[model samples]
Target: AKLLQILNVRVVGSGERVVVLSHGFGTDQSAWSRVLPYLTRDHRVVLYDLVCAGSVNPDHFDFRRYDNLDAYVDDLLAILDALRIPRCAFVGHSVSAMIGILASIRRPDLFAKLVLIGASPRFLNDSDYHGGFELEEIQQVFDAMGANYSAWATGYAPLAVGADVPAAVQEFSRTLFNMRPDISLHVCQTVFKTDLRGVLGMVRAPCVVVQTTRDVSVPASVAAYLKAHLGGRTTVEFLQTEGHLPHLSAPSLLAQVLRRALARY
Candidate 1:
């Protein structure tokens, strides 16, 4: 909390209804830079760094404070409360997508809608379910994270976004490396271990799940999984892009997709 004071978090855009952009693991609010131009044109934009994220006051990060996603979501609600934002649309990427869903479900009146990009409720596959990866595969990723954090951040993280887009690749790598080593480990564990399958049915706001067909981190099947059990009206759109960070790789298309979703709200 004291760290946030030093950080000076603030909302952007100019409309009455806020559009809060929540970033995913190993990244920060800057993750939404690509879509900001389009979003800010007509809606109030709220952006903030999660504790331990890129450019945040790392001194304020408490490992015990965020053992689960719920803690992060609590921080989000705190931000909204402090700003006195009555209602808002949530745009979440990767694990942040589920955080938004959980937050909106907890305070349906406070959240009007949710746009989940590159979302996956569960990353590891289970019996009768194909979440796109096996438990062992995730364990291997953790092993890689432990063996050489920087190498994994520099070499592997960029690949998640798509190595072809040099700027996107470098940006994602920078954010991944900007996080403290311990915090990054915690984030990786929290994302992989979380299984919010049952919670999906609790969300009440309009939902949109955007997935890239060839996402290395989250496949189209995972987005389909999220769309299957959402409690409210849900729409699933699969882009023909090839990476997890489609917002960065394909901003115009991403903007168009979100514009349609916002129109519904």
Candidate 2:
């Protein structure tokens, strides 16, 4: 399957290394719009949206193609291949965080590092584990997405941003609302269903875990748990933000953390 055509890809800065910014479940390449100003000053950047992005045509969507996270990873790899991008940093937000991991595992030659922002390896609760929500709670989100995706997006924005919804929420909601209702529901289902904790250790690329210290959606403890399970080739950095969308809410903070991570390896 073609997955989806790469929407927009840019090469910025004068560095030998490239950075592919992959977005999360509902949002698109615009998720990194704020951070690009900071990152492009130092590194070449590649940005694009997934096939299911609201702005894209759904006629090309292969439901079977994206039934799981691995399928999405395939879409990412295709973008890289089409652009002939070599090894570089793979920066992902939310679900893209795990998507980067999966992509790196498949083609370690293409990924030099993984910068995971507001990331969690697992979203569903497990034995002696707290993923911040139970499977049923996530199911509720799925149902909400199915019913009225616009309502779901608006309702979810504040929950993710905490008591004070950041201005970025309004901006992000634009992309969220752009998605087709059916596509939104399927994407949400795929996100909540992903469980990569067991395979995190298998990831070969050096991983940087950027956790929002006060995120309402993903608890800090879950970030700690992710770092511990990811084969010890990971560094966990805590950002002083309180939202699930740090790349948007706190791009400067996220950029600084990423620079620090780049210095390490």
Candidate 3:
């Protein structure tokens, strides 16, 4: 109970099959609210905020322990263990998507199917690899964050959420602003600097990669990269959406795609 409280884990509905929804960086589990109703009707749904997220207990977060993505993966496995969930369908967005991948690789028994929404194994370009951003560009982002966090959030939130709906952009910005600036920067650096390409082939669980038509963070090329390299059965589906936050910007469409993908697994 104490551990679940620390992560702000929420369980809804009940059934033989379990679905765990993990949110991306800068946002909490509430990001899944739009899709929750659809998922809960059939399978038990599990949601939780990352330790660095605003909705999580700050007292439970230790930067030293969360220095890399592996730390977040540890927390994910711990949550499943706490719930006594041996295996479940895992759906994750943004950084959380990669977090699920790493966790599944580490303990294949804990995950049955993986739905990665806007996931990227690497965020920086390397030789022939197209990670969507250059090193200097990433550095500029950190500089902007360092200069004035709120101003950066206001400008970047719209770009990250895309131009789908004004309200979605505002909601994303609000959550970005709510995060502690120090932790936000730390997590941002960790996520952007991470490179999981080498480990992609190690993932044994089946995966569904959900890609958006237009996203500043992840390009269609990255989606192709995932489908090409993933070890198990991999399906790449494109959503005719604008940004990386389709779960918020286009929830209904996202849910439809997810349902279709889940049906296959």
- Among these predicted structures, which one has the highest lDDT? 3
In TM-score terms, which candidate is top?
A: 3
lDDT of 2 at 162: 57
| lDDT by residue (tens digit), candidate 3, 125-161 | 9999989999999999999999899988988988998
lDDT (C-alpha, whole model) for all candidates = 0.80, 0.77, 0.88
What RMSD does model 3 have?
1.0
> Model 1 over residues 1-265: C-alpha lDDT tens digits?
4434644465677776578887787677777787788877688888888776858777777788788889989888888887777788889998888799889878999988999987888887889877777888878878888888987788786668763888888778888888887778888788888888988999889898887767777766777677778988888876777788877777877888887777546
TM-score for each candidate, following the candidate numbering: 0.94, 0.92, 0.97
Q: Per-residue alpha-carbon lDDT of model 2 for 1-265, expressed as tens digits?
A: 1433435445566576688888886677877777777666667777877777876678766788888989878778877787677778888888788888888778877888888877888777889878778877878877887877777889877677653656877877777778888878887778878888878888888888887767766777977787788863787887887788877777888877877666433
Greater-TM-score candidate between 1 and 2: 1
